[PDB]
Design a protein around this ligand. Structure first.
Ligand SMILES: [Mg+2]
Ligand SMILES: [Zn+2]
Lengths: 1112, 150, 105, 131, 39, 115, 263, 89
């Protein structure tokens, strides 16, 4: 019972939502591809560039490279805290060119990290994703000259560390110079080296006006290419003597060497596509038969002269235009740092040749795994494009894999981020979400791929459109880049159609991102859907058209922060993407084929498929996510149920029957409430807690090491010296806590003892033990206890002992013990609630069901929301959702209202009317008229003009109900609220609660070593940061002693904090420090620099701030 | 006090105001094909047209509130100073107005839809240019504390 | 007793630098590789910088408060508070003079 | 604003040193050369001639007389050498100076104007008047 | 803040700096904040 | 294990230039304010406990336990101090203890401090 | 120089700078006594000057001295004073402080202007030394050490000690701070009322000054220890004594949002 | 909280001199465990509690209460410093 709105029916589904991660890393590894037929891209092109090297003859070559098999599964890689990787080998043969010797063998080069099915990696047991990067695409560009208002300059740019930037500028003199590596020189000097004469340079280039006359230098056009090459070498490299063998070697490596200059394969397409020529190879110049042969300089000089002349068909390139920016996906980012570790293995080969026995050296002892291993490990563990996977819920992980970052190595920095790149470019339409982006310093830097957006082979983002020929739409879709998009006139997706033919005489369309009304004969493409413009999360916001984009940004971000719930529901009003999100997130479980279910329990689902196979599917139960949220799958099929392929078998976290279930559907009332909902605060009913709504399961891991101390080995044991039998009840035989015990802060989880480091017990300690007849143990309790504010019941245990099979551990560590604790967290005051429209709020008051505002039939609301959080934030979509939820509440139905193609206001009022007949009709059938309190409300609603005068009480109630409003009684008084009050169902999520966001409180704890400032510990929290702006505030108040306590006694003053603690302990007022410790350290650090620092008093006499301590 | 979608009531003088604006719009395109106007002062006559037409519907929104629905929640919150300003109330009831493109010079076609009737995809995307600008735009105390602390 | 109201900074003469010093650090050693105790003429020596334990010399002959101020006969260590190790300075007596680089560069 | 703008011209450049140790072109604070010149006229000696100076808030803060406060900026070494060479006494007048030292700030309850106020009751005032 | 003669000891220097810098994040709607820094 | 050189306390942590290694290391040797008070309360509460004895009873215990000079004096030195036998000192010591145990069973001041 | 976890030692760069100076100075001494030729003596004297000014200002002149196995320059005495982590910036930039806490904030409209809602657990820790003393005075424990053992080893907080905590709190004030502290009203003093839950309850009339919004904002708590600290926290920092703007003199704690809406 | 705070600001020329007076007087109250109070038993501030109404343990509250009675004298150099505490114990 779920109605779908909308006139637009998408002709194609969303792409494989993780194909930006999966297909990239697959294309780079080419695992299932035979090494004979591999396409010379990615991880093999790194070898075919590094090899073959030769420099006493040596020729190591590249034949095959093969992936190994994972030594460990993904689960035991997460359990062991080891990177999920396979060994990488390669067939390297050594050729002695002077002898003819050949020596083949296969050598270990390094461990290659492998990608999972969903599209992430496991590094040191941690799930980890590699975000895509946006950067400037290579090729040739033409921009207007800043310091010359008349002309434009050209720029040839290749891949980074793959050639230098090249500029072509026309000076005020009129001669055309060329800028390379902070050098300037005329173009003909290089053109002479390229084999051009003045006779050829004129005829094909004469038509652009007087521009050739700025290129002609008769003195340079007179010399041979041989002496022009050396004339070039002297200008840009004026260090060494200009020998002609070095001048040739330089220009060859600079512009002609394919391994030292490789303008991108995408940049070569860009150069070929922009200039209208044809380029074989990725260099600017070749080197055939001994002379240089041009490839790019003549076409790009023609385009520059053409553009400066004003010929049509030539334009300036937009810097942000998404045809001039590209995407570095996972495989490209890895294979780039791969060849870096090969260029460092190259040195590890080159230098190993001058030594040893240069006649016979195996490439086994010529090549080491250390260079490449350390290169890939730096990438997956340190690169800012590789960060902790966000798996708060299935939607979180799907979104994280689709992020596009301008930051990272080779990318931008936040200080030099500026605004140009932070902005929304007109080409983002259909490729980059214009609303989903962080709030804070990373605005516009980190974005999200659009729903229908795909990244092509060259790294450019495309979006589908429907081809239309003569006002008739075709089933043919075409993915076009931003450059190809500017070529056509493209109509909006919501243009009225008479069954696949256009209806209106005025079509809304776009030309280079410009709103233009058009006739059905001028349209050649049409948008596929409104969904293609926004990201996944933004497409999950119903009535998005009625939400201002700023709060809709928050609505997109917070769905990523929603914790999975025990009784998680799909929203009452949906957008139609909720099923596909859980499908592509790989958090649920589906049937591999047609078949029948034969076994169903909480741990496994067994089905017999067509092909006769019997497959049992293990259900992951209460597993810990990176953020501590419970990953839990639950069966959704019965025994004997016959399922089709792709049919749901088990729901993952935050999924209800296969639909994204990020929260709960709660009955909301929009009204103030005694200030408990002041400034975004939220009032909730206790009934939510009774029904376990918004209850989540969170699992935290704890860990303790038993180490080898020079004072003696630490021991995991139940024998803890001075401890009660009660404090050890839940400790098993070997000292670690039992599964199923409830642990509260301070309780022991793993018992441990450490040797004291033999010292005399103090005489007071000796007399103390003599009184109580206790003989001192030689060991102290160092057992792992549960930190404050944390707890739950133990659900997992794990022990890794050195000297036992399968496990190797850190040096000096005898064994490690891990304990897993789970807790059920029900909604409480302080928890953060939110809807998909950007409404935020902290639960401020949990109220008894009796105090809650309720309907005449006794039904109480679940949550009270303040209307004051709406007008200045301009998100009327939450109001439309509440109105639609009111209808579906009494109608007992859910709704699908797509973005920009959802439920109209009249369609909603009709449902509201049909719902009133049910609700009010059932009330008459039970024999109850219109209450006298309701008639009291109906009287005022007429005074202000909310109901029409003259109609009956039932009719006025109906006029309120289709306005979305109802009469509501105050559970505290029985009296009604004086005005009608819009109630309904709203989808509300509970947002994630980071560890540092919980309640902290310190009195006294550890202090740092060098600076004596408060430091967090296992038993105590750290102190709050009292920064300089707070110093100014206390100064502004003139509260000197308050500021003096912060800067001394409460922080780094050793004597002061000890004296103050004792003062409070003995009921004494805390004293002031006679001379603070920061003063003392400053003087001694200055005296260390041989500077006499004199501390003088009122009459200039020396004060000794060291009282008999350092005075001699 | 509560807020429902019908509390963002649209004046019936909005329909008349923007059909007058179209009357004056083609009236300016007419004077552009004749030669009476260059492209610049034609564009400036389009911007002023939508600038004062935007103010027209803003006055229409509040005048309808003041004269017909004095206890409307949106109008009461704004007049009392509880929540909202006339610029925000205008985008809810009247028209969201004239937008600004990444370069800086204002857009010719304004968004005629309010948030209650809903923006189109083009209206929504084009507005994201300026919405992100306000977000990106959104030290001195330290330099002043340094100079004057004594 | 009196309250510091001004702070002057000036150059330090050799005899003034030696006035701050509780001894000359004569050796580059720090702590013994086995005992982990400070070496006798090194950078952590208690015979100059102060005791590591409160009111307890390095050998242990005097290890109570009533002995405060007593320098040990065979230690060379004053029994007093270990807090003096943040405050007591030593010095290095150079063979030939060296220029303070601040006043040079 | 007036409090801050006044700080933008609290320094002066010496034109004629007169009978002081000052030199021509030397920059110092107006409130000092006022306190200097009223000692010189009392001594019968010739006062200092200065011209007003205008500094931005940044440049004004760098030019401060206190060496502790000046050292808290980026060129600590240059500040410290010239201060030790001159034997400069930091008088600890501003708030930043004392915060660096860890000294009670000269404002509010730390002001010389109110800090030394005493409080007594009648009994102890009579018991002490017997002294 | 008290609508009365200021007390001696009031750190009006810091207070002035806070009063001026606090709205620095509200100078948007024109020269604006760069003008203030220029001054 | 001994071959490795020490780590620098000034080893930078993270790309941020505002933290060294030693900024996060706790001081394992300096006593906390709670530890410093506990040893003082222990010395105060033991003095108050010993004040329930005769001065010889208390002086014997303070000599036997090292509260005077830091070394446990055997029965011979304490008997030489007081001019009595090793056995007479042992009886004084044992009687002084069970008097302390009696007062401790009634006040319970010293029951904690006991780890 | 101290050993950290794992047994490995951690030391300060200054030690190796001193150590390189002591080594070279001692070599110069036993070269002068051996009567070495001048070319040798001049070399040790150069290395001596290069050792001293590396202790002073490593890197200034010449290549900075580094440890084996790293390119990081050793921290000199000048780097200890100069820079952002230097001693002249340490006090100015602020510090971590004892007797402080943090929590998400909640509206708590029943509060009086001079009041805040403090979670009982947070109060029990913020005022723990005070609680130990009053647990002794009220015979709840024999002495302060026995009171600490009760709180630390029990997890069962009798109504007897909640009354004790209520008595130490009486009259006292805590500081509430929301970042960014833009003016002095970013820090205000309230009298704590013990509250059920994990959230600080903040009076709604002070939300303007703090720029507080109940959408997840967190605030810090600080307890001023001494009587001077209490006196100035109560006299000149109490929220109910700072009603008018220091910038303009206009009311800053004034009716807002629902309050205006109802009136 | 602090009733009569406006009257307390009037007794002094500077609000900060009031804080010094309240704080210093409160310190004397703690040192002598409220024996040196100038308040009569019926104007002693109390604390509403079960098991009876005890005296308010807040010394800052007493000091403000005493100051409102005029029974205290405050000023600079009003009496020698050493002779003050020596004669108050
Ligand atoms: Mg906020
Ligand atoms: Zn000794």
């Amino acid at each position: 019972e779920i109605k779908r709105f909308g006139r637009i029916r998408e002709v194609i589904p969303l792409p494989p939502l993780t194909e930006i991660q999966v297909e990239s890393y697959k294309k780079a590894l080419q695992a299932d591809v035979p090494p004979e037929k591999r396409e010379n891209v990615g991880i093999q092109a790194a070898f075919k560039e590094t090899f073959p090297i030769e420099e006493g003859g040596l020729v190591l070559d590249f034949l095959e490279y093969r992936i190994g098999d994972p030594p460990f599964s993904q689960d035991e890689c997460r359990e062991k805290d080891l990177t999920y990787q396979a060994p990488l080998y390669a067939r390297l043969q050594l050729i002695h060119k002077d002898t003819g010797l050949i020596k083949e063998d296969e050598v270990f080069l390094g461990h290659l990290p492998l990608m999972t099915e969903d599209g992430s990696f496991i590094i040191n047991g941690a799930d980890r994703v590699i975000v895509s990067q946006i950067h400037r695409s290579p090729g040739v560009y033409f921009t207007p000259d800043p310091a010359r208002p008349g002309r434009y300059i050209a720029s040839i740019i290749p891949l980074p560390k793959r050639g230098p930037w090249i500029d072509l500028e026309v000076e005020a003199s009129g001669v055309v110079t060329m800028k390379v590596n902070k050098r300037k020189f005329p173009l003909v000097l290089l053109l002479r080296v390229l084999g051009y004469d003045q006779e050829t340079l004129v005829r094909e280039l004469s038509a652009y006006g007087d521009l050739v006359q700025g290129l002609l230098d008769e003195a340079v056009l007179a010399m041979r290419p041989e002496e022009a090459m050396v004339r070039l070498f002297t200008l840009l490299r004026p260090g060494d003597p200009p020998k002609k063998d070095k001048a040739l070697a330089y220009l060859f490596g600079l512009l002609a060497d394919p391994k030292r200059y490789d303008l991108g394969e995408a940049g070569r397409y860009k150069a070929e596509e922009k200039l209208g020529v044809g380029l074989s190879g990725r260099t600017l110049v070749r080197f055939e038969d001994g002379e240089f042969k041009d490839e790019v300089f003549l076409p790009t000089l023609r385009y520059l002269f053409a553009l400066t002349a004003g010929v049509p068909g030539h334009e300036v390139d937009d810097i942000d235009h998404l045809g001039n920016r590209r995407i570095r996906t996972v495989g490209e980012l890895m294979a780039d740092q791969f060849r870096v570790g090969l260029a460092r293995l190259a040195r590890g080969v080159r230098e190993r040749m001058v030594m040893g026995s240069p006649d016979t050296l195996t490439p086994a002892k010529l090549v080491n795994s250390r260079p490449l291993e350390a290169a890939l490990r730096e990438f997956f563990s340190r690169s800012q494009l590789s960060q902790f996977k966000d798996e708060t819920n299935p939607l979180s992980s799907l979104r994280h894999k689709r992020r596009i970052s301008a930051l990272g190595p080779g990318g931008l920095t936040r200080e030099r981020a500026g605004f140009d790149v932070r902005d929304v470019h007109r080409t983002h339409y259909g490729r980059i979400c214009p609303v989903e982006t962080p709030e804070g310093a990373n605005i516009g830097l980190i974005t999200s791929l659009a729903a229908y957006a795909r990244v092509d082979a060259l790294g450019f983002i495309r979006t589908p459109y429907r081809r239309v020929k003569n006002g008739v739409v075709t089933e043919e879709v075409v993915y076009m880049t931003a450059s190809e998009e500017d070529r056509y006139t493209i109509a909006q997706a919501n243009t009225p159609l008479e069954g696949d033919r256009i209806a209106t005489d005025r079509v809304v369309a776009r030309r280079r991102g410009e709103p233009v009304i058009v006739a059905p004969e001028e349209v050649e493409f049409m948008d596929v859907s409104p969904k293609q413009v926004f990201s996944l999360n933004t497409n999950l916001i119903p009535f998005l058209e009625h939400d201002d984009a700023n709060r809709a940004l928050m609505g997109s971000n917070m769905q990523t922060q929603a914790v999975p719930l025990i009784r998680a529901q799909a929203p009452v009003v949906m957008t139609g993407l909720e099923e596909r999100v859980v499908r592509d997130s790989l958090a649920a479980l589906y049937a591999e084929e047609d078949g029948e279910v034969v076994k169903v329990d909480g741990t496994r689902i067994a089905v017999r498929y067509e092909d006769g196979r019997l497959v049992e599917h293990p259900l992951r139960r209460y597993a810990r996510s990176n953020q501590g949220t419970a990953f839990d799958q639950r069966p959704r099929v019965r025994v004997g149920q016959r399922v089709k392929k792709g049919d749901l078998l088990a729901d993952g976290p935050a999924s209800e029957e296969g639909f994204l279930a990020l929260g709960q559907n709660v009955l909301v009332a929009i009204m103030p409430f005694d200030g408990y909902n002041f400034e975004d605060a939220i009032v909730i009913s206790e009934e939510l807690l009774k029904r376990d709504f918004y209850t989540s399961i969170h699992i935290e891991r704890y860990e303790i090491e038993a180490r080898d101390t020079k004072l003696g080995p630490e021991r995991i044991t139940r024998d803890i010296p001075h401890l009660s039998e009660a404090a050890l009840r839940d400790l098993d035989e070997e000292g670690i806590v039992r599964i199923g015990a409830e642990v509260k802060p301070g309780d022991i989880l793993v018992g441990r003892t450490s040797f004291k480091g033999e010292q005399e017990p103090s005489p007071e300690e000796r007399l103390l033990r003599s009184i109580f007849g206790e003989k001192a143990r030689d060991v102290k309790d160092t057992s792992l206890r549960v930190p404050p504010g944390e707890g739950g019941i133990v659900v997992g245990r794990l022990r890794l002992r050195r000297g036992d099979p399968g496990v190797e551990l850190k040096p000096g560590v005898r064994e490690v013990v891990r304990v897993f604790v789970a807790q059920k967290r029900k909604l409480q005051v302080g928890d953060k609630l939110a809807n998909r429209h950007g409404n935020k709020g902290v639960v401020a008051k949990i109220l008894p069901v009796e105090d809650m505002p309720h309907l005449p039939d006794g039904t109480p609301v679940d949550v009270i929301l303040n209307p004051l959080g709406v007008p200045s934030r301009m998100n009327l979509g939450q109001i439309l959702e509440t109105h639609l939820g009111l209808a579906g509440y009494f109608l007992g139905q859910r709704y699908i209202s797509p973005v920009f193609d959802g439920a109209t206001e009249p369609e909603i009022k009709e449902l509201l009317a049909e719902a009133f007949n049910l609700y009010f009709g059932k009330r008459q059938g039970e024999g109850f008229g219109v209450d006298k309190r309701e008639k009291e409300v109906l009287a005022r609603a007429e005074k202000l003009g909310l109901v029409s005068p003259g109609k009956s009480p039932e009719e006025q109630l109906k006029e309120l109900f289709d306005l979305g409003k109802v009469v509501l009684y105050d559970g505290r008084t029985g009296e009604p609220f004086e005005g009608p009050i819009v109630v309904g169902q709203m989808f509300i999520m509970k947002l994630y609660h980071m560890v540092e966001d919980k309640m902290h409180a310190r009195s006294t704890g550890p202090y740092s070593l060098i600076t004596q400032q408060p430091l967090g510990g296992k038993a105590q929290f750290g102190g709050q940061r009292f920064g300089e702006m707070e110093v100014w505030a206390l100064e502004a108040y003139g509260a000197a002693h308050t500021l003096q306590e912060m800067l001394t006694i409460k922080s780094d003053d050793i004597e002061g904090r000890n004296a103050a603690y004792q003062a409070i302990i003995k009921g004494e007022d805390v004293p002031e420090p006679s001379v603070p410790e920061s003063f003392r350290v400053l003087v001694k650090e200055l005296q260390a620099l041989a500077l006499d620092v004199q501390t003088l008093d009122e009459k200039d006499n020396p004060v000794d701030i060291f009282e008999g301590l350092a005075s001699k | 006090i509560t807020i429902g979608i019908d509390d963002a009531v649209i004046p019936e003088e909005k329909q008349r105001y923007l059909e007058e604006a179209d009357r004056k719009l083609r009236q300016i395109e007419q004077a552009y094909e004749m030669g009476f106007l260059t492209d610049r002062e034609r564009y400036d006559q389009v911007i002023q047209l939508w600038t004062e037409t935007t103010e027209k519907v803003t006055q229409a929104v509040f005048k309808n509130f003041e004269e017909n629905y004095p206890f409307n929640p949106l109008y009461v919150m704004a007049q009392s100073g509880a929540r909202g300003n006339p610029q925000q109330i205008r985008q809810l009831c009247g028209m969201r107005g004239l937008m600004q493109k990444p370069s800086g010079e204002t857009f010719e076609v304004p968004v005629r839809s309010s948030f209650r009737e809903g923006l189109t995809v083009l209206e929504y995307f084009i507005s994201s240019h300026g919405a992100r600008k306000g977000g990106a735009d959104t030290y001195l105390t330290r330099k002043l504390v340094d100079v004057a602390h004594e | 007793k009196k309250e510091v109201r001004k702070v002057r900074i000036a150059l330090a003469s050799p005899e003034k630098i030696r006035s701050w010093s509780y001894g000359e650090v004569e050796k580059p050693e720090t702590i013994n590789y086995r005992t982990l105790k400070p070496e006798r003429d090194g950078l952590f020596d208690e015979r100059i910088f102060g005791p590591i334990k409160d009111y307890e010399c390095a050998c242990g002959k005097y290890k109570r408060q009533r002995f405060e101020g007593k320098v040990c006969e065979r230690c060379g260590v004053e029994v007093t508070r270990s807090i003096v190790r943040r405050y007591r300075m030593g010095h290095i007596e150079l063979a030939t003079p060296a220029a303070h680089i601040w006043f040079v560069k | 604003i007036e409090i801050v703008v006044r700080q933008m011209l609290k320094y002066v450049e010496v034109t004629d040193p007169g009978d002081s140790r000052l030199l021509e072109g030397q920059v110092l604070e107006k409130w000092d050369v006022e306190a200097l010149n009223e000692r010189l006229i009392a001594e019968g000696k010739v006062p200092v001639a200065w011209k007003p100076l205008l500094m931005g808030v940044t440049k004004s803060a760098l030019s401060t007389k206190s060496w502790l406060s000046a050292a808290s900026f980026q060129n600590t070494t240059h500040v410290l050498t010239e201060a030790a060479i001159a034997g400069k006494k930091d008088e600890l007048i501003g708030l930043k100076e004392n915060v660096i030292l860890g000294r009670l700030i000269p404002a509010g309850t730390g002001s010389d104007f109110v800090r030394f106020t005493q409080v007594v009751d009648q009994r102890t005032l009579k018991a002490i008047e017997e002294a | 803040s008290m609508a009365r003669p200021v007390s001696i000891g009031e750190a009006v220097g810091v207070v002035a700096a806070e009063s001026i810098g606090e709205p620095g994040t509200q100078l948007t709607m024109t020269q604006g904040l760069p003008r203030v820094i220029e001054l | 294990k001994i071959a490795q050189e020490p780590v620098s306390l000034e080893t930078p942590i993270g790309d941020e230039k505002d933290s060294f290694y030693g900024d996060f290391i706790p001081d394992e040797n300096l006593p906390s304010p709670v530890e410093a008070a506990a040893q003082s309360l222990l010395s105060e509460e033991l003095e108050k406990a010993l004040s329930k004895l005769s001065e010889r009873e208390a002086m014997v215990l303070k000599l036997r336990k090292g509260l005077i000079d830091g070394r446990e004096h055997t029965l011979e030195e304490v008997g030489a101090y007081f001019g009595v036998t090793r056995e007479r000192i042992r009886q004084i010591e044992n009687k002084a203890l069970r008097k302390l145990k009696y007062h401790e069973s009634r006040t319970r001041k010293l029951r904690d401090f006991l780890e | 120089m101290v050993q950290v976890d794992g047994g490995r030692f951690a030391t300060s760069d200054l030690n190796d700078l001193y150590r390189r100076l002591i080594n070279r100075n001692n070599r110069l001494k036993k070269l002068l006594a051996q009567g070495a030729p001048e070319i040798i003596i001049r070399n040790e004297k150069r290395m001596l000057q290069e050792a001293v000014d590396a202790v002073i200002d490593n890197g200034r002149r010449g290549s900075p001295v580094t440890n084996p196995g790293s390119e990081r320059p050793l921290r000199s005495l000048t780097d200890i004073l100069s820079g952002k982590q230097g001693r002249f910036r340490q006090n100015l930039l602020g510090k971590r402080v004892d007797y402080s806490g943090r929590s998400v904030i909640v509206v708590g409209p029943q509060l009086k202007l001079h009041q805040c809602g403090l979670p009982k657990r947070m109060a029990l820790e913020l005022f723990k030394p005070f609680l130990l003393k009053k647990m002794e005075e009220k015979a709840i424990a024999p002495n302060v050490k026995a009171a600490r053992r009760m709180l630390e080893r029990q997890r069962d907080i009798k109504d007897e000690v909640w009354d004790a905590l209520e008595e130490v709190i009486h009259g006292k004030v805590v500081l509430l701070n929301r970042a960014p502290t833009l003016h002095r009203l970013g820090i205000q003093a309230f009298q704590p009322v013990l509250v059920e839950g994990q959230s600080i309850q903040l009076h709604p009339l002070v939300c303007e000054a703090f720029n507080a919004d109940f959408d997840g904002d967190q605030m810090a708590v600080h307890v001023p220890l001494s009587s001077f600290a209490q006196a100035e926290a109560r006299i000149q920092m109490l929220s109910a004594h700072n009603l008018l703007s220091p910038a303009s003199g206009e009311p800053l704690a004034k009716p807002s949002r629902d309050i205006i809406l109802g009136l | 909280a602090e009733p009569g705070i406006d009257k307390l600001f009037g007794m002094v020329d500077s609000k900060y001199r009031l804080t010094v007076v309240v704080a210093k007087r409160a310190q004397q109250l703690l040192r002598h465990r409220f024996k040196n109070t100038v308040l009569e038993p019926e104007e002693r501030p109390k604390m509403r509690t079960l098991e009876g109404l005890y005296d308010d343990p807040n010394a800052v509250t007493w000091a403000m209460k005493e100051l409102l009675t005029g029974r205290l004298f405050f000023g600079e150099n009003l009496v020698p410093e050493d002779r003050l505490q020596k004669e108050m114990e």
